[PDB]
Amino acid sequence: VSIKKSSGLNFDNTAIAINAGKGLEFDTNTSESPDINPIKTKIGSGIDYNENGAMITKLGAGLSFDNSGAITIGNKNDDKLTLWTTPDPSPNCRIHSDNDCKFTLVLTKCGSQVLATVAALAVSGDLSSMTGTVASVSIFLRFDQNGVLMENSSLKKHYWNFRNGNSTNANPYTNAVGFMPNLLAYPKTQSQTAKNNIVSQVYLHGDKTKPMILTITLNGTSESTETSEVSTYSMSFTWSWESGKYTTETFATNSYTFSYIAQE
Amino acid sequence: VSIKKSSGLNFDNTAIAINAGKGLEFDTNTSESPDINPIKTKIGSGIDYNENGAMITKLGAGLSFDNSGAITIGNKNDDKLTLWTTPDPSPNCRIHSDNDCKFTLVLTKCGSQVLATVAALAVSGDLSSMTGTVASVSIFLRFDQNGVLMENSSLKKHYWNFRNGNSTNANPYTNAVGFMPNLLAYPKTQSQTAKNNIVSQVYLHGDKTKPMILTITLNGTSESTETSEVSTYSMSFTWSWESGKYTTETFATNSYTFSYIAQE
Amino acid sequence: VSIKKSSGLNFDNTAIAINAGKGLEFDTNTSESPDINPIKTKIGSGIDYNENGAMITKLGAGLSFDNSGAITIGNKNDDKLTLWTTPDPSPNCRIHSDNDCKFTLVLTKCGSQVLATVAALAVSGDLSSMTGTVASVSIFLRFDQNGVLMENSSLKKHYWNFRNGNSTNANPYTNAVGFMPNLLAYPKTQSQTAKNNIVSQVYLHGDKTKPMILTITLNGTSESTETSEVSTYSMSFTWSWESGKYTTETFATNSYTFSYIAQE
Structure with missing residues (x-):
């Protein structure tokens, strides 16, 4: 052979x-x-x-x-590079009373940064009924060390999850640290450090005669320190204006784009 | 063996x-x-x-x-994640009269969102010769159910396609649905729903003394309802200012950045 | 067989x-x-x-x-789709005198566009001590034909590199043309072409009463023409406000999001 x-x-x-x-x-x-x-x-x-x-x-x-x-x-349906409230959320947020607002937020991971878009819409009444001596609105999100939404947030937990088509995963997410605001860029603190915020002038109902200041906070002063509810990552959205104005108006914002350094 | x-x-x-x-x-x-x-x-x-x-x-x-x-x-060359007008477009848009403006728009797909950059330059004359009683400029894009630009748009069809180097695909695309504004997030409507708009104060020629308001509209109000030319998706760009201002100025905007939830 | x-x-x-x-x-x-x-x-x-x-x-x-x-x-331990100064830069920039500023800049490639976030902070004194009949602060980045930072820049060369965790690459990068502003969209010119800039009103310390204008320049008038130090690509960040204002304030900005068409 x-x-x-x-x-x-x-x-x-x-x-x-x-x-x-x-x-x-x-x-x-x-x-x-x-x-x-x-x-x-x-x-x-x-x-x-x-x-x-x-x-x-x-x-x-x-x-x-x-x-x-x-x-x-x-991605074929399931998409874990996107964390959101779904493009068309039902009432899912609280500003002054339960479920009085439709909060829209889409976080899209783009490597070291997160590209985001936000919009709010009251569905229970005009501003005067949601503020009091307050001439501002505040929506806050607190996350634990794994990026999981904490109970002490303005947003309801049920539909805050990874993308699945035009909806979310049926199962709750257990880790989204890659979507959290970087702690070195935006440290935890009681002092308002300029870098922790993104501040712009916006317009109620897109009306140029109705200006407002939108202040976005990453960690810093938006962090929860309450006993038993200390957050690791946080992020809030605050809208302010001149006291006395828009009292009869319905709070409704225009979609707003922004980005921030991700934790990982 | x-x-x-x-x-x-x-x-x-x-x-x-x-x-x-x-x-x-x-x-x-x-x-x-x-x-x-x-x-x-x-x-x-x-x-x-x-x-x-x-x-x-x-x-x-x-x-x-x-x-x-x-x-x-x-993909430095053939790139289907970028739908644009090329970065250095020739007179390709109509504000008042044919080819009176160079319109630059780049839509970059980032999964669930579209990151975009826009800029416009009048090349035929000053603001006066392009408005009339109106103190504003509008540029609109209409798309069929497949994301293909329709005849009733301000932008010309020839050089609006997927990217290829610093130019476009030789062959006209047949589907860009993944670049279209999400219909659930931005419904088609006769109503000015705040969320469908993005509104910011911009500056003419980047001059702080010449402020303008930029209202970008997604679907909704920018949709075409005209018989035979009904659009499915659309987006418009409107720049407005105090009537009677900048009459002898050339319309030239700075580059603007925004993002929006994509259809898919 | x-x-x-x-x-x-x-x-x-x-x-x-x-x-x-x-x-x-x-x-x-x-x-x-x-x-x-x-x-x-x-x-x-x-x-x-x-x-x-x-x-x-x-x-x-x-x-x-x-x-x-x-x-x-x-990518965690090595991300060449992100060129930054690290999320928490030590003094690394010069506005008036050496190391008088912590300049933070993150460039993340998103295909045809670079998604960016910027923020600066003085660490040696107030605005009066960095100006003088100025009423502005500029920070410029000049790049050679390979996208390598040049000496005639406000940012120190040492920590301007690709990402590695929350720090930089051990080795200096030799090519980042992919992060440079597109030359066709934003040409080199002694002329201030509107499209070359991005202009927005921002707030010092996020204080609605302390507005400023932020002018970002891509190539164009930000290019260095000096003998021996002629940049190919460049970008600058200029903050200007009304003369005589904020002289005892410390220069601190909020994070700013923006994007631009990449060279390749």
């Missing part, structure tokens, strides 16, 4: 056998091993086996296959 | 054969088949073969090969 | 050999080659070999493996 060792064949005690090297190996966990030890590919990270025994790239969060079977950015 | 079956080979009808396992198969599509089938690799979604027969990961939109043969994000 | 050609084996002049097809080849580099060449997988771009000899997807910038070993978007 003459073999061509120059092409993957060799001996083992004068017994012919295919000399497999890289990317190749023998399936040890065969029903007939060592007798029947079929040769197969040696895979690792990023690759997996199809139900049909075919090798495929194992895709994770953020990726998916297109039509030609190529890998593209984007 | 001694075969150590523990190493890939086997005995089929007293004939030495290769016992192929996971990730390996026999090419039954060779000129000389099924009598002579070589051993090829078993591959599925995410994997392909180049001309040299080597295995490579099949990349789609958003991904590309690093000069080190690594998979990285981004 | 009989052989089953329909199963990967063939005859080369009476020599039994394995008929290698797509995705396979013979390792002709072994210590025993060119005679005892084992059979191995033919690999190309996107794929690499484990130390264990297994096949794995070769991941580059922007990608990484998660728990289940799947390919996911995101």
